[PDB]
């Protein structure tokens, strides 16, 4: 807790991954200039690491409707985790989720201590007391896959969470995804 | 002998402003005119309020503005009788009307939802001018077996034409293609629909894109169909993995897979190469006169797997045409009537097989070797031929002429243009030669007015009366003055955004001549202008320069649009679009709704004076009784 | 005593500059509470960088970190101003 | 499964002391042999395929592995896909490759294999493997429909003092001296119907002296406790060891629970059992009259 690394105490995961958002309504009441009202908008990007596509339509009784072009915005990171959960698991069947660790650093391999957090509602090598970590090496410009086998223990909506930190840097990610548990 | 003419749209519309042109030909002093519409048949006096006078100031040209209400009045077209009374004289015509209010567009936040994920949707509501209007709308949500599972009834009054809405997808429900349908409470028959898929999915973390080096396959192409596979994460970054590719042939809606064409290639540095060989494609059917395969299509499904085994993605390019020639040839943007002796402007349309406009492609006609002309960025080529003053149908046949293609590989097509059939076969004509490029609002277009008649009554003609159709309504109607001895007069046409996406121009003159005969000579021209928002809308970045933002980070968004306009926003993880990219809203989709709603059915002209008028969305009724073929068909001539 | 060497002076400036911040870190960490999760997620990683950097008495780690923490502090102010 | 069969044999090799052989056997349940199919394997924490072997395979026909996966240093290869040109509908298609543990760890998670045809993923099958765990299956405890996790340790220098300590923690909620009636067993979970001879410290369980209470344990703990009937016992645990609802309550054999064989009347006469029978005795009075120091 004094090593060249970030602490699980201090990792705040990403969790907010909408599939669509900013379903908002703004009004060009600004002072027209050269005929073109201009609004500046303050938006907060959501946690997902992807490319957002923003679509605007304008309606004016003078000039009508107007499907603005699409406009792309890419949120990314040099290192992060992809927690690939499937749509739904069945309570009490054993599966294997994969944590994919991406390292898009130019030129140096990364050493990570990645860790599946304990969840009472799941049967994992992770206990209230003992944690479940490996320590792994990702080449640069590529991906390391990290198996975690688990067993869902309660129906309804359950939550898997992984955290990883790189050594010597102070980079860290953590994802909190949720999957449907269904009874047999 | 004074003559009064009435000119209206071919088909009127409810609850919207229409316009009709009043004219006094050869009359003296002020002429007061009253105009009245009545239900048909009988009398309801639906609109009489309007009165006007044709002053010698304004060369006796009138403005008609009226709005027909929607009173308690099917399967049989309803009509109306318009009645315009100049002084005491009383002219009238019996036109067709439509219950079609306007348009409706629906927007869904995503293209695809999972059971239990709510679907956001907007109904944009507008009149035939694409202006926001406010009516009452009904909205159904049909499940994939067609059964309305929910409807509401909403008014767009004081909502600036935008109806927000949602629907919570139940937890258990049929997967499949759902539909959202909406109509104006006035007119149930004109229904509007957008779809959305309901499925079970996790989002994919990359997109896959398949691509034939050619937009088609040439049957004699020994190499077979070559295809490049491409994968890249949503965060822009190249993919490593392996990918399974496989082909098939489509006939109509019928689909045969070529099981043997299955290939497993490595996807390296985001890309991969792969091919269907002419042999598999032929074996794969039964091995017969390749010619047979002409007309059918190909398709490729690829399926990539990351080397991590975590995430899969399918994707398929469909209906790649099997063709003997690369290009296609179309005369549907060229009129079907010329004037003997006068130069005929040919608008040849040259599409790639798929359907796309093909740029820079040479074309010319049967006869003359020296005549050539390329295809501007719109897949259009302007060729003009001087025609002979012979009362003989003029058959034209055009043909591609690309170097590096064999004369068998070149593509042709033939059309037949008939001469303009005058009054009493007098040989009096009018031509509008218009320089043809990509017109843009602001740019100024010249309309050459060319007079073709024996100088006998040449001094008589004093003026041209012109009109502009647009989104099937009158956008302007004016006069172009002329002086004797002139055959050419040029019209300065300012071109504003009100012309988009395409406007029609019909000019006509009238006179007495030969043997005391009341005449009408005319001409109609279509000009597709550059399509784009009528005002503007753009959403660029806030921070002029910057590095990629970071998950959860603040970012400033910039919106440049029309003053006072309303914007409605949505941002969508592009990962969705890798599961479904269909049924999105486009402005191009709207222009397409607006053109198919044209009342004008011809590129240009008329068989006779009275056709020019019915071809563009118009009617011409004059005192002297020279009226146009009444219009009593809602749609254009069934192809 | 006399005066310190080059290294000696720079090194001790950085450090105190650095410390100067770590001092009023906790105050900051605490303002994140109201702020959107990105702030908290950020400051916590920036905080450690410092404290390890500070104790490591190495120029790089120390400045590099000096700056990390500077930025996020500023992204906090900007934040709390759009809110009164 | 059903569309595919999957038998994953994880055996040690003959002739290190850790290295072994992973064998994968698949058959397609259908009329024709499947087309192109995926084997999506993962290593047990600490292992990674013998390279010299993996090549061999990829040289093979019907099989291929991407250069991309070959080039990596065996150490960097903890998952890996083996593509197949086919899998017979007729008999089992099998193969294997020596794996080597290069890394020393306690608690080595199970590897797993997965299969499917490229076209359709939902028709997969998925077999785990592991050196000790029977089926690569984690340790759970399920009665009827309710399961709870049992990958912990079995129950675990004894002085009246060491007991007046560990036996007053938060968890402790039942302290019993019970005699064991019925010793049942099953292939999944063995149980025990011990009746209570004295309620030393009562819990959320309203149980009067004499009544019978049903304890349970994983089949993997046969060694931890020598089971004898009519053998009396001292034991305590937590109220989180309670199974299902009342009053048909049960007890769960865990880590936080403690087990000690309470001698017999005339067995304590021995001159080596005395160090116990006495500690016990005292403990009894020290928990009934006084209670817990805290
Ligand atoms: C073309 C048409 O239908 N009407 C026009 C309209 O611009 C207006 O009534 C006036 C100009 O002020 O002249 C006329």
Swiss-Prot record, chain A:
Q: Which residues cross the membrane?
A: none
Protein name, entry field:
Complement C3c alpha' chain fragment 1
Q: Which domain of life is it from?
A: Eukaryota
Complete-protein stretch covered: 751 to 934 of 1663
Curated annotation (Swiss-Prot), chain C:
Relative to the complete UniProt sequence, the shown stretch is 33 to 116 of 116
Function description: Involved in countering the first line of host defense mechanisms. Efficiently inhibits opsonization, phagocytosis and killing of S.aureus by human neutrophils. Acts by binding and stabilizing human C3 convertases (C4b2a and C3bBb), leading to their inactivation. The convertases are no longer able to cleave complement C3, therefore preventing further C3b deposition on the bacterial surface and phagocytosis of the bacterium. Also prevents C5a-induced neutrophil responses.
Q: Which family does it belong to?
A: Belongs to the SCIN family.
Q: Does the keyword Secreted apply?
A: yes
Region (Essential for activity): which ranges? 30-47
Under what name is this protein listed?
Staphylococcal complement inhibitor
UniProt superkingdom: Bacteria
Q: Which UniProt keywords apply?
A: Secreted, Signal, Virulence
Task: Give the subcellular location.
Answer: Secreted
Disulphide bridges, residue numbers: none
What sections of the sequence does the record tag as coiled-coil?
none
Please name the gene that encodes this protein.
scn
Give the main localization category: secreted
List the GO terms this entry assigns under cellular component, sorted alphabetically.
extracellular region
Curated annotation (Swiss-Prot), chain D:
Identify the residue position(s) of the site Coordinates Mg(2+) for interaction with Complement factor B Bb fragment (CFB). Answer: 294
Any idea which residues bear Phosphoserine here? 204
Q: Which residues are glycosylated?
A: 248
- The NTR domain extends over 154-292
Can you list the disulfide-bonded cysteine pairs? Answer: 1-125, 25-94, 142-147, 154-221, 168-292, 268-277
User: What are the boundaries of the region Interaction with CFP/properdin?
Assistant: 265-290
Q: What is the official name of this protein in its record?
A: Complement C3c alpha' chain fragment 2
Lineage of producing organism = Eukaryota, Metazoa, Chordata, Craniata, Vertebrata
The gene designation is C3
């Amino acid at each position: 807790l004094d090593e060249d690394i970030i602490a699980e105490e201090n990792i705040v995961s990403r969790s907010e991954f909408p599939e669509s958002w900013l379903w908002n309504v703004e009004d060009l009441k600004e002072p027209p200039k050269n005929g073109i009202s201009t609004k500046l908008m303050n938006i907060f990007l959501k946690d997902s690491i992807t490319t957002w596509e923003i679509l605007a339509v304008s309606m004016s009784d003078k000039k009508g409707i107007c499907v603005a072009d699409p406009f792309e915005v890419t949120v990314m990171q040099d290192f992060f985790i992809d927690l690939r959960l499937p749509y739904s698991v069945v309570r009490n069947e054993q599966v294997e989720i994969r944590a994919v660790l991406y390292n898009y650093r130019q030129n140096q391999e990364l050493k990570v201590r990645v860790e599946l957090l304990h969840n009472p509602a799941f049967c994992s090598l992770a206990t209230t007391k003992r944690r479940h970590q490996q320590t792994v090496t990702i080449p640069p410009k590529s991906s390391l896959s990290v198996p975690y086998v688990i067993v869902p223990l309660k129906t309804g909506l359950q939550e898997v969470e992984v955290k990883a930190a790189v050594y010597h840097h102070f980079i860290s990610d953590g994802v909190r995804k949720s999957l449907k548990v269904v009874p047999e | 002998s004074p003559m009064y003419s009435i000119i209206t749209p071919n088909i009127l519309r409810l609850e919207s402003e229409e316009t009709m042109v009043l004219e006094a030909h050869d009359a003296q002093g002020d002429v007061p005119v009253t105009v009245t519409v009545h239900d048909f048949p009988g009398k309801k006096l639906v609109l009489s309020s309007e009165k006007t006078v044709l002053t010698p100031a304004t060369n006796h040209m009138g403005n008609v503005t009226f709005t027909i209400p929607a009173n308690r009045e099917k399967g049989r077209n309803k009509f109306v009788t318009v009645q315009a009374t100049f002084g005491t004289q009383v002219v009238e015509k019996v036109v067709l009307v439509s219950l079609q209010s306007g348009y409706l567009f629906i927007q869904t936040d995503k293209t695809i939802y999972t059971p239990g994920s709510t679907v956001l949707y907007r109904i944009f509501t507008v009149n035939h001018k694409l202006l926001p209007v406010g009516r009452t709308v009904m909205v159904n949500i049909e499940n994939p077996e067609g059964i309305p599972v929910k409807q509401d009834s909403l008014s767009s009054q004081n909502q600036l034409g935008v109806l927000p809405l949602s629907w919570d997808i139940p937890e258990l429900v049929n997967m499949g293609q759902w539909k959202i349908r909406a109509y104006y409470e006035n007119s149930p028959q004109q229904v509007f629909s957008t779809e959305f898929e309901v499925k079970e999915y996790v989002l994919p973390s990359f997109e896959v894109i398949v691509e034939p080096t050619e937009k088609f396959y040439y049957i004699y192409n020994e190499k077979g169909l070559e295809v490049t596979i491409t994968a890249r994460f949503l965060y822009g970054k190249k993919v490593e993995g392996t990918a399974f590719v496989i082909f098939g042939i489509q006939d109509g809606e019928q689909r045969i897979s070529l099981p043997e064409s299955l290939k497993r290639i490595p996807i390296e540095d985001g890309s991969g190469e792969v091919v269907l060989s002419r042999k598999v494609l032929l074996d794969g059917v039964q091995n017969p006169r390749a010619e047979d395969l002409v007309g059918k299509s190909l398709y490729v499904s690829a399926t990539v797997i990351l080397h991590s085994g975590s995430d899969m993605v399918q994707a398929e390019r469909s209906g790649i045409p099997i063709v003997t020639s690369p290009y296609q040839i179309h005369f549907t943007k060229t009129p079907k009537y010329f004037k003997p002796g006068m130069p005929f402007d040919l608008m040849v349309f040259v599409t790639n097989p798929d359907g796309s406009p093909a740029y820079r492609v040479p074309v010319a006609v049967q006869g003359e070797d020296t005549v050539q002309s390329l295809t501007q960025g719109d897949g259009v080529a302007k060729l003009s031929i001087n025609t002979h003053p012979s009362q003989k149908p003029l058959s034209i046949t055009v043909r591609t002429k690309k170097q590096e293609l064999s004369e068998a590989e070149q593509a042709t097509r033939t059309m037949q243009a008939l001469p303009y059939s005058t009054v009493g076969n007098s040989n009096n004509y009018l031509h509008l030669s218009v320089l043809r490029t990509e017109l843009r609002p602001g740019e100024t277009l010249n309309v050459n007015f060319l007079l073709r008649m024996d100088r006998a009554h040449e001094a008589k003609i004093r003026y041209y009366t012109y009109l502009i159709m647009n989104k099937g309504r009158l956008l302007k109607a004016g006069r172009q003055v002329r002086e004797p001895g002139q055959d050419l007069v040029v019209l300065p046409l300012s071109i504003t955004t009100d012309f988009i996406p395409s406007f029609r121009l019909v000019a006509y003159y009238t006179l007495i001549g030969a043997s005391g005969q009341r005449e009408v000579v005319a001409d109609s021209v279509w000009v597709d202008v550059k399509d784009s928002c009528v005002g503007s809308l753009v959403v660029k970045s806030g921070q002029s320069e910057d590095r990629q933002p970071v998950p959860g980070q603040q970012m400033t968004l910039k919106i440049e649009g029309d003053h006072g306009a309303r914007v409605v926003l949505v941002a969508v993880d592009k990962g969705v679009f890798v599961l479904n990219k269909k049924n999105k809203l486009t402005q191009s989709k709207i222009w397409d709704v607006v053109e198919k709603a044209d009342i004008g059915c011809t590129p240009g002209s008329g068989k006779d004076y009275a056709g020019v008028f019915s071809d563009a969305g118009l009617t011409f009724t004059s005192s002297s009784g020279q009226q146009t073929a009444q219009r009593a068909e809602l749609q254009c001539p069934q192809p | 005593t006399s005066l310190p060497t080059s290294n000696e002076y720079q090194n001790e400036k950085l450090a105190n500059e650095l410390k100067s911040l770590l001092d009023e870190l906790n105050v900051n960490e605490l303002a994140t509470g109201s702020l959107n999760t990105y702030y908290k997620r950020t400051i916590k990683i920036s905080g450690q960088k410092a404290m390890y950097a500070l104790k490591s008495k190495d120029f790089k780690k120390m400045s590099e970190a000096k700056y990390q923490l500077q930025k996020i502090y500023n992204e906090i102010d900007e934040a709390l101003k759009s809110k009164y | 499964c059903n569309k595919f069969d999957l038998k994953v044999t994880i055996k040690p090799a003959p002739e290190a002391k850790n290295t072994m052989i992973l064998e994968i056997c698949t058959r397609y349940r259908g009329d024709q042999d499947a087309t192109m199919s995926i084997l999506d394997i993962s290593m047990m924490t600490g292992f990674a395929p013998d390279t010299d072997d993996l090549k061999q395979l990829a040289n093979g026909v019907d099989r291929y592995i991407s250069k991309y996966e070959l080039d990596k240093a065996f150490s960097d290869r903890n998952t890996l896909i083996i593509y197949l040109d086919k899998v017979s509908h007729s008999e089992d298609d099998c193969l294997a490759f020596k794996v080597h543990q290069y890394f020393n760890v306690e608690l080595i998670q199970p590897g797993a294999v997965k299969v499917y045809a490229y076209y359709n993923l939902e028709e997969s099958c998925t077999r785990f493997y592991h050196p000790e765990k029977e089926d690569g299956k984690l340790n759970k405890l399920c009665r009827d429909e309710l399961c709870r996790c049992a990958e912990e340790n079995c129950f675990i220098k004894v002085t009246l003092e060491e007991r007046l300590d560990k036996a007053c923690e938060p968890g402790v909620d039942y302290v019993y001296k019970t005699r064991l009636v019925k010793v049942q067993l099953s292939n999944d979970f063995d149980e025990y119907i011990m009746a209570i001879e004295q309620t030393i410290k009562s819990g959320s369980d309203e149980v009067q002296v004499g009544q019978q209470r049903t304890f349970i344990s994983p089949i993997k703990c046969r060694e931890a406790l020598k089971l004898e009937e009519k053998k009396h016992y001292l034991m305590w645990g937590l109220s989180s060891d309670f199974w299902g609802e009342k009053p048909n309550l049960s007890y769960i054999i865990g880590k936080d629970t403690w087990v000690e064989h309470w001698p017999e009347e005339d067995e304590c006469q021995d001159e080596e059992n005395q160090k116990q029978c006495q500690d016990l005795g005292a403990f009894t009075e020290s928990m009934v009259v006084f209670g817990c120091p805290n």
